[PDB]
Amino acid sequence: LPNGNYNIKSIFSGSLYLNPVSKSLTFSNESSANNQKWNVEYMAENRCFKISNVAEPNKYLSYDNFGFISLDSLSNRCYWFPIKIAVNTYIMLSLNKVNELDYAWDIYDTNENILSQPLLLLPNFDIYNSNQMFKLEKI
Amino acid sequence: NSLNDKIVTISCKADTNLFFYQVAGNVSLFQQTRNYLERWRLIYDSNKAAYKIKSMDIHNTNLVLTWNAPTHNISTQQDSNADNQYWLLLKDIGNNSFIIASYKNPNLVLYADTVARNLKLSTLNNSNYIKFIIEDYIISDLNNFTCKISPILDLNKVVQQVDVTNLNVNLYTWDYGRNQKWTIRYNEEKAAYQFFNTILSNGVLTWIFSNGNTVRVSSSNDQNNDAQYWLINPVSDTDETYTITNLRDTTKALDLYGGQTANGTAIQVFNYHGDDNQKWNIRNPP
Amino acid sequence: NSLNDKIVTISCKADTNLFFYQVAGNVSLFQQTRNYLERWRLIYDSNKAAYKIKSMDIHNTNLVLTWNAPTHNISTQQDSNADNQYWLLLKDIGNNSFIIASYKNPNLVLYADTVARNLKLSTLNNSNYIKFIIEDYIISDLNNFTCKISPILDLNKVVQQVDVTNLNVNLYTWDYGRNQKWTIRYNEEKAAYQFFNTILSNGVLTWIFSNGNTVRVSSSNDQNNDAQYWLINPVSDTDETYTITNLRDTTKALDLYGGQTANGTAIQVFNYHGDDNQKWNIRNPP
Amino acid sequence: ENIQEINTAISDNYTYNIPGIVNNNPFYILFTVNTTGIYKINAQNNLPSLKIYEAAINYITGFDSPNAKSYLVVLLNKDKNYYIRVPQTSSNIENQIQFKREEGDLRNLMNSSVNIIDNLNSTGAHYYTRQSPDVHDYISYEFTIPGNFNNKDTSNIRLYTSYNQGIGTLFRVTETIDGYNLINIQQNLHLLNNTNSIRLLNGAIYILKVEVTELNNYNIRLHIDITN
């Protein structure tokens, strides 16, 4: 996964884009703004990726003590371990085991509708959970 | 078809002195008010198997507990019957507490932020911060309430025990005496209340069916007497007014002898009639 | 603790014909067997406020439902009282079903894969795949069970209705007729059962209390007669033997007249003493 | 045919730049590995395809089809020598040969060339002709099912051979920062005139590893017919 700026999308929708809304992360209508742009940087020492918001470049995708993905300053919670499962489809694990499991970005859907859902961090067991699949589109 | 349409208070297992409190669209956690600001009607939708939680606010009558998805915030918004306004009420058996999960995303449940005094969300875990006590508002208001009890025919009079040794019960003018105050206790098992007189450690208001129609207080370490127990029913469209019916014989309401607003008038039971010497004001002693 | 030590079956809200079934450490979803392979003892720990779900397997006596962390798989493993062997039983009120959450990680709950016919852990959603029916195993076994009923004094004879027009109930040699078969139905509200004779549509075993100790079949569109309803209590050490007591007066037990075993012998009610003529085998019709 | 040499024994990672002045001729690279292990070897964009030889000199794997994309996955012993035949770059852009030690699932692919298939844009018939490995030797194919991926949309894939009999193993491919992950989804697939279809996810990547069990033709021709 090359370094650079990406849009981030759920496989449930090709027209909804990851952005912060208050302290949550959600997928929204295309804005063409910096807040839908994500700077992916590989970290050689731990073989993971940190992912910062272009609009707020000192804030990274992280997670809180409540099960939500968040946008925070750098910490070991900001390291993501992706599993590429298709062209530019990924499962995004936290680098750290959480509650001694793999945990992954997870977006809840109601009949494939994700509007207004917050992105959460939930257990991962395999590569087939649709709610854990995300598109990284270079742009 | 058990909680549906019930008006309840909701308090925190992590802090039983904090209740869900609503003012102008804002939901917080606040001490007990015994008024509509902390009352909620549970409105069941049978096809969703989930509930709307609706504020009994007398000014804005259409506000329901709402998750402001995708944020961490909970507020009250106009009822639009939206998924973010429905909640699964999951009773944790053995614990007698509830988890309250969002219908819109059942992985997320209410979390009591007791330091911030407001509501948040969390995935499920074992902490007390996601457990809640849901109680019929009358029980909630009266349980462990220390009150004074007045006939509506003379508010300045009061049901009293006579003294620490004379365990008889008569009417007398309010003088703030401990013999004139009652700590109400709800017994979840018998689904009824007892009135503990505060001049005794274990003296409770007891219908002495033996001498027919009369009422004294006596020891509460007599264990299985269902005349030591009472039912309290709100007189319709009041705030403080109730009927008090005895457990052993629910036709037998607590009665002010003859309607006589006078000192020393006997307190007894009589057959129910909805008639004014059988209505009572239960209030905080000023 | 109202569930502590209870023996239950657990079936799928998604497919009520599928039950949790255990053999040699494997948990699967299987059709009803009415035997120990589908029975589980709920074991409460008050400190954790969570339950072990212990298989009633007769050979391996210490197997409990276990989450195979970090995978999403479930199995039965030896009981070591581990957090991954404890479960929160969360009753979804109004839906009469349970969500069963891992105590080790309540983010995850049991999910029924009805096409692989096994269980896994899953995050929450609003589907019936995460909802289960937990039922006392006797109610589970007998509810909607079409049976024949025999006195233990002679298992070759059955309690029968005489014929379609003759509503009397007597003892006769088993001949496979529908007047000799009964469909048991549990009434949720009454917490009691009826026995519908299969030769009729709405005819139930009834104590004719206005005629002393007589029992006959009569119609079940007589609606509030407790005399139409029965308690069915297992006899210890036995798989098929029950005492059957009348809901109107539980001291009245289904009774074989005299303990006589001849064809035609009366079936009646009598004061309960637990003699052999008040014990009944409820069995599959061969 | 100028033989060049990587004098230093390579380990884990190595990149060798084609001079460019040797592109007008088939040319060889002599090398050895620091430690015995399974290596992925390829040109810059898997182009051109490479051949590898053991040094007696013995052909191991690889072929020579012009404009055919491929990479080699081979078990290399630190005791022996190895030759890489690079074919004619009839286009004077400078190429690079990449050597990488594989510690993960790609080890399932030794020893074989993996053909990059990139013309599966639709339903219908497709086939691919390469020089056939001898009996018990392997040839692999990495392809992507046409369509957009949604973990639901799916196509019927008929995989078969024309003349040679072969046993196929089908893998599902995912990728992390550490290279490929492989899920072995099918085994023992008899390819010669196989009439069984397989439903595979649209937009997903798969690898078919084929073991030649009967050499009836100098070439092996793999058919991937797609229906919906």
Numbering used by the authors:
A (entry chain C): 8 to 146
B (entry chain D), C (entry chain B): 9 to 294
D (entry chain A): 380 to 434, 454 to 626
Text lifted from the article:
We next separated the HA complex into two major components: the central hub composed of homo-trimeric HA70 and the blade composed of HA70D3–HA17–HA33. Their crystal structures were determined at 2.9 Å and 3.7 Å, respectively. Specifically, homo-trimeric HA70 forms the core of the complex with each C-terminal HA70D3 domain binding to one HA17, which in turn simultaneously coordinates two HA33s. Each HA adopts an almost identical conformation in the independently solved structures, despite differences in crystal packing, suggesting that they represent physiologically relevant conformations. The 12-subunit HA complex is stabilized by numerous protein–protein interactions that include interactions among the HA70s of the central trimer, between HA70 and HA17, between HA17 and the two HA33 molecules, and between the two HA33s in each blade. The N-terminal domain of HA33 is fixed in the HA complex through extensive inter-HA33 and HA17–HA33 interactions, but its C-terminal domain is largely unrestricted.
Here, we report the complete structure of a bimodular ∼760 kDa BoNT/A large progenitor toxin complex (L-PTC), which is composed of BoNT and four non-toxic bacterial proteins. We found that L-PTC/A consists of two structurally and functionally independent sub-complexes, the M-PTC and the HA complex. The HA complex is composed of HA70, HA17, and HA33 in a 3∶3∶6 stoichiometry and adopts an extended three-blade architecture, whereas the M-PTC is situated on top of the HA complex platform. BoNT/A absorption is mainly mediated by nine glycan-binding sites on the HA complex that together form multivalent interactions with host carbohydrate receptors on intestinal epithelial cells.
